[PDB]
Amino acid sequence: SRTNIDIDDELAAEVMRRFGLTTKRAAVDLALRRLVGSPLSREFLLGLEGVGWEGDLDDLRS
Amino acid sequence: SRTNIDIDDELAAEVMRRFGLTTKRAAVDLALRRLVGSPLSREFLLGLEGVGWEGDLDDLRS
Amino acid sequence: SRTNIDIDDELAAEVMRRFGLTTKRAAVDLALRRLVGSPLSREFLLGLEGVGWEGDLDDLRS
Amino acid sequence: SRTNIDIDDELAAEVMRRFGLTTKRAAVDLALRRLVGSPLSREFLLGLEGVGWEGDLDDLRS
Amino acid sequence: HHHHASILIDTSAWVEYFRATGSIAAVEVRRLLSEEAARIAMCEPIAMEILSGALDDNTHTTLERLVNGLPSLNVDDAIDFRAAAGIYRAARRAGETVRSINDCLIAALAIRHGARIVHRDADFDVIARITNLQAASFR
Amino acid sequence: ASILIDTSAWVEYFRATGSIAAVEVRRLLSEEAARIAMCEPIAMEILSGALDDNTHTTLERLVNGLPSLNVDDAIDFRAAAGIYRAARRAGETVRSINDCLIAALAIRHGARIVHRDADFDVIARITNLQAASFR
Amino acid sequence: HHHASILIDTSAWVEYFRATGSIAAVEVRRLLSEEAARIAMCEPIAMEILSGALDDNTHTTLERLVNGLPSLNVDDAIDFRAAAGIYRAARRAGETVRSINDCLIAALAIRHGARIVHRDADFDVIARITNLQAASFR
Amino acid sequence: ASILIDTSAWVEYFRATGSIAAVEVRRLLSEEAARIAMCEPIAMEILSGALDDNTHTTLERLVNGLPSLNVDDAIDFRAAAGIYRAARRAGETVRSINDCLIAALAIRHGARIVHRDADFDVIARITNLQAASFR
């Protein structure tokens, strides 16, 4: 994961301007999370069936 | 600019798979650029062809 | 705060006459306030009272 | 003409920022001219009657 | 606090004055210039129209003095073009006819600034039927 | 400090109801116009009830002519959710989840809200939202 | 050459969460099993989901889900006005819309080129008057 | 360098006429989307002819989602006027004064304009306007 790559400095800063980020680790992280998310394993996702949701969707909508 | 930062191998690989890129650096670049690029998707933009326009440009101009 | 500047006398006089102000300072302050004030005029803003609204806020908010 | 005058610092600064002006004097002149324009005598205004206008407003509008 | 009831003279009235037609519009313009000069405003769409139809370069120069001299009501493109569009579409929906979309722009800017329009163009009659534009016709 | 007028108060003004909220909106327009702010959730509400074409253009002018307090996609929805949950915990109800959103954005911007909706009364009791009710 | 994201609406999500066994829940399960890579979240949906999470552990779990999925952003230069437009159109059509946030969701979906999987009549209405791609599982 | 697509080209695209202009618009959308810009005079034209509600909403979305090249009140109208005058003196005909405004805007921004309107052909002879005709 320690990875040696060319990252456009301007671009990383440009993202730092736009999103009020104070890093590059912040910009890259965001960039990646937005586009493909974070690792969600198959078992996790399947395990959500029956996890429960006690709120009322009618209250939130109508 | 050449930078060594921890990038999760698997997220980058996912990016590569989804966008047909051959390197992690390219993937990361793409992810950064999407963050500060156009808010209108290709799909939306191409979907406008044939949407219609019922006014008369002659009235507005000629 | 206080400063020494050139002000076109005639212009200042005109402002004073048109807005019924007694001093150059007042004239300058009013001009500066109008310059950075709302793009929506007082007249337009007060004209909105009784413009109407056809919606039902209860439906929008439940 | 030159005069000593109290000008709200903040407003002046704002004006300088918005219009990319580098002096308080310039800011103040701009503000005054927004209010009353530049001197047009009654004589000049009345002298415009019959000056001529050989264009066609139908061309410009329809 | 400090009210000012600006009067925006439309190109349509201006032209009458410039040509000295003796029409009620020209006379009204004259009156305005003699009695209400301090209330008269210009805007850049009107200015563009005025300059555009000045064929003689000397006359054009003179006109430039006028349009540069009068206090200006600005066009703010964060607001006024959309408002014009809205006006125009409403007119269309009403089955009304609008000769010039720049009349809708002018009216939009007048409404924003709280100015009344003196004119002789039916477009402004139309627009005052669908918005709260203060307009006075002199045909 | 920006003054964010809520839809609840705005509507009063638009319909010239004469209620205290309408009068306060009028006052705001008269005396503090340069401090009045808009946000896009409020804008959406206002335009969604402007079914008359003329009303719509007019209120669109209003929305476009006021400074905007942005919605931050990264946090504001989360904040709103948090607020909602807190309200529930406090044994209160919120009729509209978008009031939570609006309040979140106000808190982020340091803006104060002028309103006549009990939701903002609730939210000021579980956050540091600066809200003034004219109900 | 990337395929269209699939935005699962709160309406379908809830079924899945509750293990109701309805066609919606089954569809969501299928999506999770067979097309996980195409699933997207947006912040309005996220807000809804977290707001109905009463139990704290459950809430925590759902936060993981919501931060774990790729996100389709809300851009307030565009999406709120578009939602308003959608709403007004619906109203003029004589249609009823129970949640203005469904118009927002649809607006963002259209912008992003995403299709919606749902069980809420609002999305049916919206697909009638826009080019929203919506699939009802009710 | 920004690419302003003129209303004339846009309309071809919206109506799916299959003209060279429509196809070029499509190409632009496909391959050079990041360089496409809008301006408010074009926007006004586009929205004025969008009479259907859905059409108006979606073209509103388009106009709001493209980067805007500003109208500078102090300069652009004067520039347009000048352009018009020059055209008339050249013995040319200009159908729309707002085409002169748009071209002024384009020249000020250093933007090129993609169109199918003879007005821009006229204006590129008498100015430094970067215009691409697909008539």
Numbering used by the authors:
A (entry chain H), B (entry chain K), C (entry chain U), D (entry chain D): 2 to 63
E (entry chain C): -4 to 134
F (entry chain E), H (entry chain A): 0 to 134
G (entry chain G): -3 to 134
Sentences from the paper on this structure:
Virulence-associated proteins B and C (VapBC) are the most abundant Type II TA system present in prokaryotes. VapC, the toxin, inhibits protein translation by cleaving either transfer RNA (tRNA) or the sarcin-ricin loop (SRL) of 23S ribosomal RNA (rRNA) or messenger RNA (mRNA), and this activity is neutralized by their cognate VapB antitoxins. In the present study, we also show that VapC11 cleaves tRNA-LeuCAG in a Mg2+-dependent manner.
The VapBC11 complex crystallized in the P212121 space group, and the structure was solved at 1.67 Å resolution using molecular replacement, as described in the ‘Materials and Methods’ section. As expected, VapC11 adopts canonical PIN domain fold architecture β(1)α(6)β(1)α(1)β(1) topology. The N-terminal domain (∼1–40 amino acids) in VapB11 forms a RHH structural motif. We observed that the α3 helix docks at the lateral site, while α4 interacts with the active site residues of VapC11. Consequently, this mode of interaction may sterically occlude the tRNA-binding site of the toxin. The overall architecture of VapBC11 adopts a closed conformation, where two VapC11 homodimers additionally interact at the α4 and α5 of diagonally positioned VapC chains. The highly conserved Arg (i.e. Arg62) in VapB11 forms complex salt bridge interactions with highly conserved active site residues Asp5, Glu44 and Asp116 of VapC11. These interactions consequently overlap with the potential metal ion binding site of VapC11.
